[PDB]
Each structure stands twice: as structure tokens, then as C-alpha cells.
């Protein structure tokens, strides 16, 4: 879960 | 009291509750309301999108964490804190935590555990205003959050 939150979160960061 | 806590809790609680219930809390926020209203607009726009785009992953996390009561929220707390243990902190991660919180809040309502939304919102708020408080303040708090995710009108 924490790895998934990091991955999703870093992807949101890149998108914006 | 701690205004950063108060504002963060209000925004996060309002988002989680309106997601869980499908209904906006109709009573306007009277304190730091302009920024808090923009933060809620931002969460509906970006947060709803995170949940849609990553629905399968979010469902997998929901399954793994098995959050069904307040004691289980302590487990989410440890997970969220350790997200940041790789030394990386950014707005993407922060909004993703709140987004996943909404996803959990919806599920809690379906199993008649709406009562656990308060501890859930407190746990997410705590990561922001205690664990990562210094970063959050340096980044201009909720005004910074709103700025980062704002849409330029062309």
C-alpha cells in the first residue's frame, strides 16, 4: 500500500 | 488552537464526508473560507480523478489494509507516515492520501461504519500538520495546495 501511494502520488505530481 | 490543524481537518473532513454521503455540507465555512472553498474545489476535481484513474489500485489497498474500525485506522496511519520515509514529499502524494481517504470513507459508509470517518480524517490531517508540518508550512499551506493544482484559463 505505501509503495502504491508513492507511485500514484508521484504520478499525480508529474501530471501537474 | 492550531489554525493549520483546524483548517486542514475542516477541509479533509468535508471532502471525505461529502464523498461518503454524496451530499455537500450546505453550511458555508466561515473561517479561512475562501482558501478552504478553493481547496474543496481542488479536491473534487483532482481527488475524484485520482480515485477514478486508480480505482483498481485503490481497491487493492482497501483489501490489503482491511479497514473496518477505528483500531484499523492506526494501521493506515503507519502506512501514510512511511510513504514519506524515502525522503520524498510533494503535493501529488498529499492529494493522493486525501483521495484514498475519500475512497475508504465511501467504503466505511457501506459497512455502517460512518463513525470511523472522524478518526480517518484525523489520521490524514495528522500526517500533514504534524508529521510533514514543516514541509507543508514552507509550501504555503493550503494556498500552496490550491496554487499547485490550479487550472490556467486560456
From Swiss-Prot, chain B:
Induction conditions: Expression increases early during phorbol ester-induced differentiation along the monocyte/macrophage pathway in myeloid leukemia cell line ML-1. Rapidly up-regulated by CSF2 in ML-1 cells. Up-regulated by heat shock-induced differentiation. Expression increases early during retinoic acid-induced differentiation.
Motif BH2 location, chain numbering: 134-149
Cell location: Membrane; Cytoplasm; Mitochondrion; Nucleus, Nucleoplasm
Residue interval(s) of motif BH3: 39-53
Post-translational changes noted in the entry: Cleaved by CASP3 during apoptosis. Treatment with taxol or okadaic acid induces phosphorylation on additional sites.
Crosslink feature (Glycyl lysine isopeptide (Lys-Gly) (interchain with G-Cter in ubiquitin)) location: 24, 27
Motif (BH1): 82-102
Highest taxon above the source species: Eukaryota
Annotated function: Involved in the regulation of apoptosis versus cell survival, and in the maintenance of viability but not of proliferation. Mediates its effects by interactions with a number of other regulators of apoptosis. Isoform 1 inhibits apoptosis. Isoform 2 promotes apoptosis.
Subunit structure of this chain's protein: Interacts with HIF3A (via C-terminus domain). Interacts with BAD, BOK, BIK and BMF. Interacts with PMAIP1. Interacts with BBC3. Isoform 1 interacts with BAX, BAK1 and TPT1. Heterodimer of isoform 1 and isoform 2. Homodimers of isoform 1 or isoform 2 are not detected. Isoform 2 does not interact with pro-apoptotic BCL2-related proteins. Interacts with RTL10/BOP. Interacts with BCL2L11; may sequester BCL2L11 to prevent its pro-apoptotic activity. Interacts with GIMAP5 and HSPA8/HSC70; the interaction between HSPA8 and MCL1 is impaired in the absence of GIMAP5.
Recorded family membership: Belongs to the Bcl-2 family.
Name recorded for this polypeptide: Induced myeloid leukemia cell differentiation protein Mcl-1
Species annotation: Homo sapiens (Human)
Residues of the full protein shown: 172 to 324 of 350
